[PDB]
Write a protein that binds this ligand. Structure first.
Ligand SMILES: CC(C)C[C@H](N)C(=O)O
Length: 366
């Protein structure tokens, strides 16, 4: 890790834990600095305020409190911090897609995009909108990280959970896979499986992944991954509308997806890409995205049940992560590998939310 930085006391708790993986940290930091400390379509105070709205969806006081202070240091009108109603109508129009991005991105529709781009006194342009979608999803994914790693307040360790053999069964089952129409059914099975001051910055506070207005667990509709991908569709849309941010996102997605030390717990010299692919593809499954050429049976073979409960809680209900839940899975793995799982999951989650929003923009433009 970036040890001298981490133990210096000069960067915040979140960045300290990110430093555990220097190759991801660089990509994280570049986007962070772009969004919050580089001139762009939106003014500094608007961007911090948009981030407060995003973090409030998950009741994340670490991130709300952090952006509240920056908003004020950068010249934001303090009255906006009394709640959304005091904020410009342009910022308020973002509430619906904030909520949907955070909890049910598959519900994002071109009619949502239409309401946003609607001609009026203060209209969203496409570069402004794209920067705001990136801001919203970035702080949603960061709320996952904050809760999943037990990141402590800056007020008076950086984590309540970290502190800066079934492994052999797992390693064996990985080797089997490498050596080698129910496939649509195995996806459906994995997807249907079920496991206060901030209130003034949101609409519909109790809206979440699970729909309690209906019986039975949450099952998003199935989306065929190939219909709209990052590599072929989404990346290209963002580099056209927000060039300086698409490249940095693409680099972050690949930095996380390919990150490896070729270690598995106490063990070395192991290809772990089947395992990491299953963590990624499970999370995308949770958001309804199906990859054709993937056997979703691999998820249950590779991801123990305590790991799936943790992954799904951190991605869909981060407020509800506990130390016990963090401790219960992968008992013999290193802490850094737990942090690694959290990186994979925030990136998988963010790409899914983004792609649904980007698909909706594309459908609107046609
Ligand atoms: C266990 C996995 C999350 C990561 C593993 N430590 C690797 O280097 O690939």
């Amino acid at each position: 890790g970036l040890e001298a930085l981490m133990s210096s006391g000069r960067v915040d708790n979140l960045a300290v834990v990110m430093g555990l993986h220097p190759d991801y940290f660089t990509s994280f930091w570049r986007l962070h600095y772009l969004l919050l400390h580089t001139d762009g379509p939106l003014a500094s105070s608007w961007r911090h305020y948009i981030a407060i709205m995003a973090a409030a969806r998950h009741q994340c006081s670490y991130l709300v409190g952090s952006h509240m202070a920056e908003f004020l240091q950068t010249g934001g009108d303090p009255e906006w911090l009394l709640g959304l109603h005091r904020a410009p109508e342009k910022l308020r129009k973002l509430s619906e897609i904030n909520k949907l991005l955070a909890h049910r991105p598959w519900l994002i529709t071109k009619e949502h995009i239409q309401a946003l781009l609607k001609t009026g006194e203060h209209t969203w342009s496409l570069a402004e909108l794209i920067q705001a979608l990136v801001l919203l999803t970035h702080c949603h994914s960061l709320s996952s990280f904050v809760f999943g790693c037990g990141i402590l307040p800056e007020g008076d360790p950086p984590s309540e959970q970290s502190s800066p053999r079934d492994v052999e069964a797992l390693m064996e089952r990985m080797q089997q896979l490498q050596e080698s129409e129910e496939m649509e059914s195995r996806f459906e099975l994995e997807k249907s499986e079920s496991l206060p001051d901030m209130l003034c910055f949101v609409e519909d506070p109790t809206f979440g992944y699970e729909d309690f207005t209906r019986r039975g667990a949450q099952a998003p509709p199935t989306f065929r991954a190939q219909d709209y991908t990052w590599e072929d569709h989404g990346y290209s849309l963002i580099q056209r509308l927000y060039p300086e941010g698409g490249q940095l996102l693409d680099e972050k997605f690949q930095a996380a997806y390919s990150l490896t030390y070729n270690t598995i717990a106490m063990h070395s010299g192991v290809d772990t890409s089947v395992l990491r692919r299953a963590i990624w593809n499970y999370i995308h499954c949770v958001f309804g995205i199906r990859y054709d050429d993937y056997d979703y049976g691999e998820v249950n073979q590779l991801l123990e049940r305590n790991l799936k409960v943790y992954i799904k809680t951190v991605a869909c209900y981060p407020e509800k992560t506990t130390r016990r839940m963090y401790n219960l899975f992968w008992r013999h793995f290193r802490h850094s590998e737990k942090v690694h799982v959290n990186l994979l999951l925030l990136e998988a989650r963010m790409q899914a939310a983004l792609l649904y929003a980007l698909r909706a923009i594309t459908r609107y433009m046609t």
